[PDB]
Amino acid sequence: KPEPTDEEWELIKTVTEAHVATNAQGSHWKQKRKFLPEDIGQAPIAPEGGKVDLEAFSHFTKIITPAITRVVDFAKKLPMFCELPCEDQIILLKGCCMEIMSLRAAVRYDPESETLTLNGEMAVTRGQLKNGGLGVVSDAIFRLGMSLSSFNLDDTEVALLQAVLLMSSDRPGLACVERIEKYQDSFLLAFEHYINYRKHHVTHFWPKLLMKVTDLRMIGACHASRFLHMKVECPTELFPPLFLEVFE
Amino acid sequence: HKPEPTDEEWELIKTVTEAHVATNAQGSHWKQKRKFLPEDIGQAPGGKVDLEAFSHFTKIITPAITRVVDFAKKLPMFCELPCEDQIILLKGCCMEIMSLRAAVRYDPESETLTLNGEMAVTRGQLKNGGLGVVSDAIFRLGMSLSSFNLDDTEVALLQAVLLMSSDRPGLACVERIEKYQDSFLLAFEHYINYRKHHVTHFWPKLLMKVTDLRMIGACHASRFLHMKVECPTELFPPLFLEVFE
Ligand SMILES: O=C(O)Cc1cc(I)c(Oc2ccc(O)c(I)c2)c(I)c1
Numbered sequence: 436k437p438e439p440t441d442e443e444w445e446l447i448k449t450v451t452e453a454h455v456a457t458n459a460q461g462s463h464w465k466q467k468r469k470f471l472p473e474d475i476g477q478a479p480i481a482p483e484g485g486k487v488d489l490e491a492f493s494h495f496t497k498i499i500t501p502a503i504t505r506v507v508d509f510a511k512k513l514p515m516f517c518e519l520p521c522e523d524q525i526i527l528l529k530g531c532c533m534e535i536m537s538l539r540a541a542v543r544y545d546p547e548s549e550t551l552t553l554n555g556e557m558a559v560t561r562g563q564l565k566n567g568g569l570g571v572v573s574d575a576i577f578r579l580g581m582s583l584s585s586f587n588l589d590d591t592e593v594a595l596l597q598a599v600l601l602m603s604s605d606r607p608g609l610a611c612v613e614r615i616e617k618y619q620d621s622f623l624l625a626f627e628h629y630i631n632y633r634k635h636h637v638t639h640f641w642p643k644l645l646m647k648v649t650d651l652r653m654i655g656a657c658h659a660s661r662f663l664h665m666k667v668e669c670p671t672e673l674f675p676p677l678f679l680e681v682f683e
Numbered sequence: 684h685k686p687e688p689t690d691e692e693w694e695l696i697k698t699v700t701e702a703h704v705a706t707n708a709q710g711s712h713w714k715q716k717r718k719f720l721p722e723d724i725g726q727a728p729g730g731k732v733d734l735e736a737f738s739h740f741t742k743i744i745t746p747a748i749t750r751v752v753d754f755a756k757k758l759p760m761f762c763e764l765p766c767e768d769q770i771i772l773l774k775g776c777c778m779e780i781m782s783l784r785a786a787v788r789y790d791p792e793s794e795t796l797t798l799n800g801e802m803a804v805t806r807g808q809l810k811n812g813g814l815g816v817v818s819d820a821i822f823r824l825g826m827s828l829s830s831f832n833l834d835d836t837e838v839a840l841l842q843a844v845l846l847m848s849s850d851r852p853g854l855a856c857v858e859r860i861e862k863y864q865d866s867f868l869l870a871f872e873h874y875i876n877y878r879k880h881h882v883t884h885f886w887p888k889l890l891m892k893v894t895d896l897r898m899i900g901a902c903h904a905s906r907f908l909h910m911k912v913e914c915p916t917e918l919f920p921p922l923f924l925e926v927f928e
């Protein structure tokens with residue numbers, strides 16, 4: 436099985452460093468994290484269904500800007516992305532923002548505590564993340580977390596996965612569709628070969644990881660439909676500057 | 684590189700792996716043959732045992748107990764021990780090994796444990812089925828085992844280790860057993876260096892799961908006592924009674 440070529444190791448070093456340089460978990464999150472108090476976002480023990488717990492929502496939005504910002508820095512550290520028109524860059528960033536963020540939290544899933552550590556600092560439960568606003572998306576991200584545990588992804592693999600999510604040529608309104616596909620394929624090929632190098636113990640690893648890319652897309656779309664409910668149920672004063680633009 | 688298995692250890696590894704495989708009935712993956720226990724059974728309504736759920740479990744429990752015994756009898760080291768120690772070691776590790784077998788068949792997607800590789804149950808069905816909080820402990824262990832990707836050999840060696848526990852009350856040949864256990868641990872350690880898992884501190888964390896299993900085994904025993912008080916005698920298969928006496 437083909438391992439990465441010299442040229443691909445460069446790209447790999449480039450994406451890996453960009454990810455690590457913008458991954459706030461570069462200080463042992465597992466040891467640094469703090470658990471969000473059980474009082475916040477607990478089952479509310481209602482007609483019309485899940486109503487966003489403004490209290491919980493408040494804690495999530497107070498640390499969401501840095502997460503959004505870090506996704507932009509990540510893309511901006513990739514030469515290929517920097518070659519794209521300003522218009523495409525934006526379209527791509529808006530389309531993958533929550534996909535990438537979701538991946539980042541999912542990879543910080545902890546079976547023993549049943550939590551996801553947001554921004555490598557805030558540990559939360561299904562209930563908390565659900566009642567805080569993501570609704571069933573909460574369940575989706577946790578499932579992704581559970582399914583990714585056996586994959587043992589390192590920074591390079593998460594970085595490459597982020598880059599594949601970034602170079603999505605099917606986003607609506609893109610100008611350089613063909614060029615973006617070329618970039619994505621280059622990441623896929625490097626990823627594919629890096630995987631062979633690492634030698635994971637799981638059958639049909641490549642095919643299974645690709646399906647995870649699909650889950651993230653589903654997750655990204657649900658985020659958007661989820662944001663619509665937030666706008667109805669949450670007062671403007673709770674929305675950070677960038678958070679709004681992300682779905683605009 | 685760390686020490687890999689010696690020629691002699693590859694022999695012990697071949698023996699235990701075959702014993703486990705021959706007694707696990709997975710020559711045809713549990714996934715493509717398992718059946719899900721219907722949601723109305725053991726559905727949410729300490730606690731009181733759901734006789735119907737319990738009935739379903741004790742209906743396939745004898746074969747599981749039996750395979751654990753056949754696993755041990757397939758190990759030459761185990762056969763050199765006195766009948767009395769064999770009984771003690773079996774009663775001591777039975778639920779530990781079964782719990783471990785259910786835990787490696789944990790499925791994140793459907794959120795179930797496939798018992799005997801044929802019956803998929805939820806954390807809820809298993810709990811109301813009689814195990815109470817032990818169900819949580821086992822599901823928990825199944826969740827943490829996911830990243831370890833253990834193959835037949837590793838689960839096999841783990842079982843050999845749980846089996847040869849020289850600290851069980853009443854054992855006569857404590858030294859011999861202790862020695863047998865170490866032979867398995869050492870070959871395990873080496874087999875591990877040969878596999879090369881990508882989980883940090885893999886060895887120490889796996890050893891810690893043995894700890895968890897001993898705790899699960901002890902909790903099942905006190906869970907059994909509640910069962911003897913709440914479940915009609917008829918729902919107890921004979922071998923199920925003798926093992927957990
Ligand atoms: O973990 C990281 O680095 C990134 C990250 C940060 C956060 I705050 C987060 O939670 C969200 C996101 C959107 C949203 O509308 C709500 I309410 C909560 C997730 I999922 C991931």
Ligand SMILES: O=C(O)Cc1cc(I)c(Oc2ccc(O)c(I)c2)c(I)c1
Pocket residue numbers: 737740741743744747781782784785797798799800812813814821
């Ligand atoms: O999965 C396997 O191979 C072995 C296995 C088989 C069964 I049935 C099982 O469930 C139990 C065990 C004890 C008990 O008192 C009750 I009620 C249910 C478990 I956990 C494991």
